[PDB]
Design an enzyme around this catalytic site. Sequence first.
Site, PDB file in Angstrom:
ATOM      1  N   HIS E 133     -30.883  -0.500  19.923  1.00 35.86           N
ATOM      2  CA  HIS E 133     -30.476  -0.815  18.564  1.00 35.86           C
ATOM      3  C   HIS E 133     -28.965  -0.872  18.418  1.00 35.86           C
ATOM      4  O   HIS E 133     -28.376  -0.162  17.601  1.00 35.86           O
ATOM      5  CB  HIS E 133     -31.038   0.193  17.580  1.00 35.86           C
ATOM      6  CG  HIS E 133     -30.997  -0.271  16.164  1.00 35.86           C
ATOM      7  ND1 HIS E 133     -32.007  -0.035  15.263  1.00 35.86           N
ATOM      8  CD2 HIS E 133     -30.072  -1.025  15.501  1.00 35.86           C
ATOM      9  CE1 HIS E 133     -31.721  -0.617  14.115  1.00 35.86           C
ATOM     10  NE2 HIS E 133     -30.560  -1.221  14.229  1.00 35.86           N
ATOM     11  N   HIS E 135     -25.434  -2.709  17.457  1.00 35.73           N
ATOM     12  CA  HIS E 135     -24.786  -3.711  16.617  1.00 35.73           C
ATOM     13  C   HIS E 135     -23.479  -3.968  17.370  1.00 35.73           C
ATOM     14  O   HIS E 135     -22.652  -3.056  17.471  1.00 35.73           O
ATOM     15  CB  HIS E 135     -24.437  -3.151  15.249  1.00 35.73           C
ATOM     16  CG  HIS E 135     -25.584  -3.125  14.289  1.00 35.73           C
ATOM     17  ND1 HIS E 135     -25.734  -4.056  13.289  1.00 35.73           N
ATOM     18  CD2 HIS E 135     -26.595  -2.238  14.128  1.00 35.73           C
ATOM     19  CE1 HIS E 135     -26.780  -3.746  12.546  1.00 35.73           C
ATOM     20  NE2 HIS E 135     -27.319  -2.643  13.037  1.00 35.73           N
ATOM     21  N   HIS E 319     -24.536  -2.707   4.635  1.00 36.82           N
ATOM     22  CA  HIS E 319     -25.143  -3.955   4.184  1.00 36.82           C
ATOM     23  C   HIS E 319     -24.432  -4.706   3.059  1.00 36.82           C
ATOM     24  O   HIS E 319     -25.041  -5.533   2.382  1.00 36.82           O
ATOM     25  CB  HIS E 319     -26.613  -3.710   3.835  1.00 36.82           C
ATOM     26  CG  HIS E 319     -27.386  -3.072   4.958  1.00 36.82           C
ATOM     27  ND1 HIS E 319     -27.745  -3.764   6.091  1.00 36.82           N
ATOM     28  CD2 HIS E 319     -27.787  -1.796   5.148  1.00 36.82           C
ATOM     29  CE1 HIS E 319     -28.323  -2.938   6.943  1.00 36.82           C
ATOM     30  NE2 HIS E 319     -28.362  -1.732   6.392  1.00 36.82           N
TER      31      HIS E 319
HETATM   32 NI    NI Z   1     -31.687  -2.254  10.483  1.00 41.19          NI
HETATM   33 NI    NI Z   2     -29.350  -1.698  12.147  1.00 39.15          NI
END
Ligand code: NI
Ligand code: NI
Lengths: 100, 100, 101, 566, 566, 566
Positions: E133, E135, E319
């Site tokens: 996971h 980024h 986000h």
């Molecule tokens: Ni996510």
């Molecule tokens: Ni994520």
Amino acid sequence: MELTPREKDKLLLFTAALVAERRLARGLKLNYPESVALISAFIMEGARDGKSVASLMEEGRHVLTREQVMEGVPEMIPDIQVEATFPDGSKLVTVHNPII
Amino acid sequence: MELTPREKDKLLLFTAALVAERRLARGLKLNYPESVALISAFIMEGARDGKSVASLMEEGRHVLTREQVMEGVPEMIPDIQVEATFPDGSKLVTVHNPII
Amino acid sequence: MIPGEYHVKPGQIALNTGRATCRVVVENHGDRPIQVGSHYHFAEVNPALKFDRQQAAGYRLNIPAGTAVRFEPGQKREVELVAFAGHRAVFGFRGEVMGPL
Amino acid sequence: SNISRQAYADMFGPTVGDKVRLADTELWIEVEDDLTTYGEEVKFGGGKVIRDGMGQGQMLAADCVDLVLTNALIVDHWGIVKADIGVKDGRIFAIGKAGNPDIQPNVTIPIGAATEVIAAEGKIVTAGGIDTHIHWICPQQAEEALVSGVTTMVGGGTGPAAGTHATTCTPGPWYISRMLQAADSLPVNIGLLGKGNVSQPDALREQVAAGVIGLCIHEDWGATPAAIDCALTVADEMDIQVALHSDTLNESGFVEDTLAAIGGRTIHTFHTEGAGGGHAPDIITACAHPNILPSSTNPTLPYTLNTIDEHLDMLMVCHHLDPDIAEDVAFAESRIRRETIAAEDVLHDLGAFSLTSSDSQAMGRVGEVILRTWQVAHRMKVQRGALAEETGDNDNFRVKRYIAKYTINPALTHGIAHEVGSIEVGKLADLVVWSPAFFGVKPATVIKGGMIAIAPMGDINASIPTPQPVHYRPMFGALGSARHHCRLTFLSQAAAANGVAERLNLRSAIAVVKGCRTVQKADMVHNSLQPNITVDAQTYEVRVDGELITSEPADVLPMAQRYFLF
Amino acid sequence: SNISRQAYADMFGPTVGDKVRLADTELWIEVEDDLTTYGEEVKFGGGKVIRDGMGQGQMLAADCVDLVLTNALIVDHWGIVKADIGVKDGRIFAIGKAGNPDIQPNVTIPIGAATEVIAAEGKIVTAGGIDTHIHWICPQQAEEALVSGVTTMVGGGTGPAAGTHATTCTPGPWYISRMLQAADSLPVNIGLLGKGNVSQPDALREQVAAGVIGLCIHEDWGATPAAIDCALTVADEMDIQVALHSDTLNESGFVEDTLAAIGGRTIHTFHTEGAGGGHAPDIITACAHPNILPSSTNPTLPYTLNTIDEHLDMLMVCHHLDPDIAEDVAFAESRIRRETIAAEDVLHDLGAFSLTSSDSQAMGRVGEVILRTWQVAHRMKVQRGALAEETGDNDNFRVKRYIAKYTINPALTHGIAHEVGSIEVGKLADLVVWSPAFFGVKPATVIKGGMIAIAPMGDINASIPTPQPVHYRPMFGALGSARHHCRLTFLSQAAAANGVAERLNLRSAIAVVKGCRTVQKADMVHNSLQPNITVDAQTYEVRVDGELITSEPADVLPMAQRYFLF
Amino acid sequence: SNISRQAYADMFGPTVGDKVRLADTELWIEVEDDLTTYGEEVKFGGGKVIRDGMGQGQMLAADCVDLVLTNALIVDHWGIVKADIGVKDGRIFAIGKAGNPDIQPNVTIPIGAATEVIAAEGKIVTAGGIDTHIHWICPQQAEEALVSGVTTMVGGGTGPAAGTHATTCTPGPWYISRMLQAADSLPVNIGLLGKGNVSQPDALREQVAAGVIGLCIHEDWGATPAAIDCALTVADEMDIQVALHSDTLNESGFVEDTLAAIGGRTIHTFHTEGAGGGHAPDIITACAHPNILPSSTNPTLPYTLNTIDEHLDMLMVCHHLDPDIAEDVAFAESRIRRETIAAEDVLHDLGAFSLTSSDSQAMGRVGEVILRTWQVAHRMKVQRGALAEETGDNDNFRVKRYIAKYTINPALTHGIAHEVGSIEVGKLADLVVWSPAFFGVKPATVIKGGMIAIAPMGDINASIPTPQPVHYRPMFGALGSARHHCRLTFLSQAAAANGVAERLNLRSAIAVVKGCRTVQKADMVHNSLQPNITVDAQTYEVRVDGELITSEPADVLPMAQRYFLF
Ligand code: NI
Ligand code: NI
Ligand code: NI
Ligand code: NI
Ligand code: NI
Ligand code: NI
């Protein structure tokens, strides 16, 4: 100044020791890295003053006591080593069981 | 903070100066790198305060005297230069024969 | 004790020995200063310097290598020249010779 | 015209008869010759000599050098002379008089549009050091060594692993290939040593065919007579050097048995004094034989006040010894002897020990090979005075004898002297420029293969390269493909013929070692003494011709507290 | 002769029946087996066993291993055993008894001249972690993750850009190609994920043909039933994994609709607890299905005193949510729930959640995947005691269940288990050596593809690698071409067949993913529980079989203030 | 629905008629146009517009851009407009309305599965700066310059050597080849300048054929009429630029003689004010001729309280001048004149000086070319007010005139304007994103060839990229092969045809310079003034049309103490 890689590396040890030094002053029990950094910088200044290897190997064991560091820390440090430029050049200082 | 490479480089000069500053306080005669680092940091703080280039070029020669540094050190430093951000931007300060 | 100090022996050095030399009176007729280098072909210096260009042909200033001589506006002085050596071929400067001599 | 000698020295650097102190030592060099024509010196700058039609000619690139180091004071095993240095194709082109033949006399080094300039007036130029005792414990040692002035590194290792920590061995084909590839990233000339402790010749030949330029025999892997003989047999057929670290425990025999197994064949004995390893306590007697090329590791150079105290714990860590195991600590006092430590300094001064190395991170300091060689020279002049070979009131001969210890002698011993080791025409341009006040301690410029690889650099955003903070930073010679073009990966002749460079897809220049079996003690420049040396088995006293050899421990040394921040 | 058990442990490390505490936790492991022949252990050093004719044989390179990790204590999903580890060609060669067959019995791992040695006695050896996971917000994460013991990184991104900040997606052919090339510079195994939110199959196939090993469906790009179904359709035909971050807003439907669109097809659900994203508040119920491979992101592991306070602002930044926009803040309390946060810790302990990951710089800490998995194990032992599967007075089973969470289970889920994930013969030698006092926190050595890539290193100019300051520095395994040879760039089968590696001129080793569609919850080693779990829509309480699942917030944890400077 | 202008600005950035202050200066820009359709703006995030079927389409990669910078406020020589920027294949694809044509109107920049997103709302986007006066004294300047927003560097040098310290010259074929190779490692576009001081055409042609894009004539190498004429002759035939640093000493003639030798042929005069070099004291009069493209070096921009005091010693060091040699110090007061220093600021404001550069580490600061150009604009607005070309109550025209000084004008002058220099379709995507509070001082993002090369980054192990400490770190665009793919090495047409890139095995993209002989003062965007300027030989006063030109020294400037730590 013409700072070589090794002189710059030691600026790291010195700065790490400033962190530990302030924390001990507030009265916190020091952790693993803080301890090593603090005693290691002690020794370097020892050589700058011109103290001998033999003297520092002894004095290095009286910087921090078992009641000044976190649990398990003294056993996490069987010995401490640091090299510094003494009047007669670079020398290695080994302090066995620094914290008691 | 968004620290650029040059601002980070100066953190090196500042930290080197902390080492020299403590040593002079113990009363040791400073060596070559310690001297340059100490006088160089003096000047940077001078600009931060807003002192002019001309003022610092003079004050820079009264930070350390010949009796405060090791033998041969004053001749090892014909001049010292450091740049810092003054109120009117970056400027170069040259101090000739800082130690007398 | 001084780290890396020199212990230069006393005396003097004789420069460009065994070479033809000549003195020339030069006058700066320009309004701005002019400075000539040690190895610059004198006969092709700034046009504002008035002197016998014909005599300075193939010569350069008889001064220690790297140094220079200044002429403030209106200045007049006598300088000593020394002859070029090697192949005695001049290329460059104001491009008045561009070849031997 | 005329110029006084002092003004002349300030302008173009010292000339014939002038003396210069080396850093803060008692060593003084005197200029022996000057290759210039007074008044015709080349100087770079506004209104100076190196300008079109004047000190710069009209010749094409092929007809002029790429780089010129103007008014340099060379210090090399062959002389201490003043001259300009010409560099072409990454190699030393000439040592003479730089300039333009059109207008200047005696120009032997032509300057053209293609010529870059390094102003060396007032500076001392030397060849790059060569450390033949590297433990590849980490890649960070190359930068450290380069900043000190060492441009070539020979040794072995795979990284921080027990084997490497203890020995200079790059074990087998896979690790050799891996280290050969990793080497392209390092800014210094490199040559690898394999593990030579095996009584089966084919296991050694493979490593040599894989790329190593030598084999290291180490007691940790078993330095038995069988192993030694096997390594020397292969060395003889493949033209590679053997580096020895004998049996300290006397487990298979004493020093004389090791000497017997060697059988008068060429061999380089590591840390011949013994503190770093070897037959206790007389491995030092090896310096008396014609086939032994002896060297010292730097922690014992020079004998000082804290040397002994320090060494007791330095021993353990390196070779994975246990301080609780009686046997592992018993041989501590047999390993570290004050008597041999003091004698070693003298033996260097006499020429009985021919090389100096570090023994990086396994009882030695990578960035102190040059620094310590000079500290010894200083101390020996102070204690014993002038050498019998000195002439005039200078330390010139002692300087050539000691500078050869980390330059040419290491180059001959490992068969790379044809490429590096000294400032001679045709050799790779690995040069170091020093300010006399910092000679041997911190370089002004470090040139690799014709390009500056590392140099002290000030504020990057400053209006000039001199404002603080000034510290060593990598230059263009240390970048990507330029680095590849300025460094050499030394291969064995077999590896070279097998196409190892093409198969591993090595990007750097390649050089082959040769003449490792034919060098002998008598070839070591200025350091060829074969003394009648004995060592007392009990008292550990060292004697040469019956006379006792010894020196006193220094309390203070130069090139120390005046230059370092820590 | 005879030796006491204590002296034996000090010399060769603990043996059968001995217990060892993990760092400063309450977890104790007990040695289950020892593969040595007592008295025939191999030890490296002066006068030790690994010396010519003794513990070192005469065999050629082809007949002996390149590296041997002597006396290691292995901790893997399959056992906690004492043995020597053999490494050949960058791969795990064997787990057995190292030595010389000429003189020692039961030698299964031969030591020769070509064998390097790593002394692992008293240390714990594990496989390298695998973070699925990532980024790719910056290249600096690879070093950080490597120092923590994670040797493989799967994720997506292009750098610090809004898309990457929020999602693990490397959008399109150009960015994929660019990231595939940039990856050769990183010292860890890498695999990329593309953007899978599209209702047009060809837009996905391109990315797969371009090089991605999976597709990430993220609500920020639109996690609608159409998109989900489209990505899973392509995944089924190209043998790639789909990572899901569902519709938190319930905009297109609730969790059961997402489950319906998936249609019982294989899928890896990211941060299944929900705090990091997914249907509010019951995305956690997915761990009950046979086709879902659930994992957690580390900020919520384990439930502590400051977890909730922290999470409220961590949400926004990631986000690109606006704290002023009511709608952007309203779903904060629906996203971060104390009830699910506490339940997650238990669900891991039971085996209902099979993986742990970071969610690097988007609600997770890259260098804390290993550290936090163990902090959970500690806390769960402290609160719930022994697992029903434990045998003997040790925490052995709980240790295998938790270590599999960041090693083998992540490897199976993404189809790279054939190359990495555990210490089994034939697998890439990605190993981590730990001192028991620093297990899970700071490694002693980190080995990549058979070479040390990073390790703690002391003063470079010191006479030994141990003087201060000691900090992690890159080793040879992390340099130029050696790095290329020790790392893998995972490609999709299509990308591999299309010659993407030759066209992009990738320099690293290539590995192909396979078996991503056939793995299921029952395949996840030690973590295959499919519990009958429910979540109360209002109270957010988590229930398994009607019983309430929960745990208490820790005020203090191990592997924290005792080891870090900041 | 309806939205208030303020809320609108907070959400999507300012629109038509809104004004924005540049950092902490008195300069205000006003949005001149907005290319969006109100209500149809694209925004990335949870529940935002860029999601499948909505703002993201179903088109394949070939039919959509790779990157979209949403809601950007562009500041370029051609306008200060609000629009989305599309990037495809590392080049600027379009400036328009981004989105999905399936559901949104006027979409000119398509967003698909292959599109990455950079949210630029509230930020100011500009092209990357171009510094045409680099002294390659060290490789560390490239990072420094990149962080400031300069994406292209033209200059010459070989490293810290006397020649380079003083001049921007990469002497000869060998050094050129070496620097061309070393350049692949640098994250900025590079073009080299050779040494042009030679009266032999073939010596110049070689350097051009070797790879240089221009020739620098410097007085330190001899800036005589013969040399100047020779360089301009070759330039005319090879389509390369000549950069001049005239004869300060008036040794071969005055400024009018230099002008005569040039003969009305195209030439770029370096530091036209004179403080950095050139005929004392009237080299400034060159800005009046149609063939001269004049520029300034940054130390004199803008005239401040400490400028003069500083400059006296800065002179010496750079050109190796001796403070004791009367002649070397006499020309100090003739070089540094307060009168010309003040006039220069005005001459920029009027458009008489067309470029700004640094003169890196030789009297100029590499990371301050952008910063100082704006400090001048500020000071000039403060002292002289609105320009005669301004319209409306904004500083828009003065901003376009000054931004063109370090972007497009430098690009035209050196023949690389076809590849970089401004934000126009088809040009390399070298973009800089700024937060209005830090405009001109510290960038938010720096994009090279379509990938982020450097950006401010916080704690690597943090749960988000924003926690402290935040400082500039290299991103993926700066790594290995990705870097090669995102940077350009500018070659001369001859070098390109000779296959220099294939022979040196250069890994980066190649671009050829062209149109260097045809540009003239009238082509310099917004800076084409040819004033009737005179300089008093004695008083040094600068006069334009008889009126005196001058300005006052600033005691305090913006973009200074509020942003820097030192
Ligand atoms: Ni996510
Ligand atoms: Ni994520
Ligand atoms: Ni040894
Ligand atoms: Ni050794
Ligand atoms: Ni200039
Ligand atoms: Ni310049």
